[PDB]
Design a protein around this ligand. Structure first.
Ligand code: FMN
Ligand code: FMN
Ligand code: NA
Lengths: 126, 127
C-alpha cells in the first residue's frame, strides 16, 4: 500500500448526486470496494466527529457551484477515523454539470512522512 | 513534494481523444492554462526522455479500454522534466464512455529513491 489520493465523480442529475466513478486510490484509502461505492452519495464517509458546520459548507458550495477545499473527519469501512483534505470542483461534460472530488488522507500522509523522516535521522546518527 | 494532483477527462468518441475537463492541480503542475489544454490530446506532456515503452503501455490500455498505471517522464510548458505517476481509467457517464486520468508529480520521490538505491549498492559493495 502506497499513498494515493481518492478521486470520485458524481452525477447531480441523478437522485442524491451519487458517485458514478471512483478510483482505486479511494478504494484503498477508505476500505470500501467499488461495488459498495458506485451509486451512493459520498456522505457515507462521515461519522461521529464530522463537523456539521463543514458539511453545511460543502452543501452550500455544491448549491452555488463554487470549488471548495476543506479538512474534514471521515471514517473507513472498518471505523478508522482519518482526516480528509477534500477538494470538490464543479465542472461540465456535454453541457451537463458534474462534480469531481479529490480526497487526501492527511493522517496517513503524516504517519508515512514521519516514518521516513525518522529513518533518515537514524542513518545520520550512524 | 507537496503539490496537488492533476485530473483530466477525455472523450474517446471524439477524434484523437481530446481533453474535455482539466483541473487546477494539472494547470499548476504542468504550467499550461486551461485554454491552452482543452481540446488537445494529453501527449503534449511528452518529450525527449518520455520512454516509448511506457507510451506503448498507455496506448495499449486505452485501445483495450482497460485501466493503466505508469511512471512516465513528462514536461512542463517551460521544458522542465517531471516524473508523472499516471493512472488512467475508463468510466461511464450517462451511458457514454470517457477516460479519466490522474497525474501525480513524484519527481522528488524518484530523486530520493535513486540516491537510496545507490547508497544500498555502495554499502553492499563494502560488505
Ligand atoms: C464530488 C463529491 C465528493 C465528495 N466527497 C466527500 C468526501 O470525501 N467526504 C465527505 O464527508 N463528503 C464528501 N462529499 C459531500 C457529501 O456527498 C454531501 O454533499 C455533504 O454531506 C452535504 O450534503 P448532505 O447534507 O445531504 O449530507 C462529496 C460531495 C461531492 C459532490
Ligand atoms: C485521460 C488521459 C490522460 C492522459 N494523461 C497523460 C499524461 O499525463 N502524460 C502522458 O504522457 N500521456 C497521457 N495520456 C496518454 C496520451 O494522451 C496518448 O494516449 C499516448 O501518448 C499514446 O498515444 P499516441 O501514441 O498516439 O501518442 C493520457 C491519455 C488519456 C486518455
Ligand atoms: Na510517441
Amino acid at each position: 500500500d502506497h499513498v494515493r489520493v481518492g478521486v470520485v465523480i458524481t452525477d447531480p442529475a441523478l437522485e442524491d448526486n451519487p458517485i458514478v466513478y471512483v478510483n482505486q486510490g479511494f478504494v484503498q484509502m477508505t476500505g470500501y470496494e467499488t461495488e459498495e461505492i458506485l451509486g451512493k452519495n459520498c456522505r457515507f464517509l462521515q461519522g461521529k466527529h464530522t463537523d456539521p458546520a463543514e458539511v453545511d459548507n460543502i452543501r452550500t458550495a455544491l448549491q452555488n457551484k463554487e470549488p471548495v477545499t476543506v479538512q474534514i473527519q471521515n471514517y473507513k469501512k472498518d471505523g478508522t477515523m482519518f482526516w480528509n483534505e477534500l477538494n470538490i470542483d464543479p465542472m461540465e461534460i456535454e453541457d451537463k454539470t458534474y462534480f469531481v472530488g479529490i480526497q487526501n488522507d492527511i493522517t496517513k500522509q503524516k504517519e508515512y512522512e514521519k516514518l521516513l523522516e525518522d529513518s533518515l535521522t537514524e542513518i545520520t546518527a550512524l
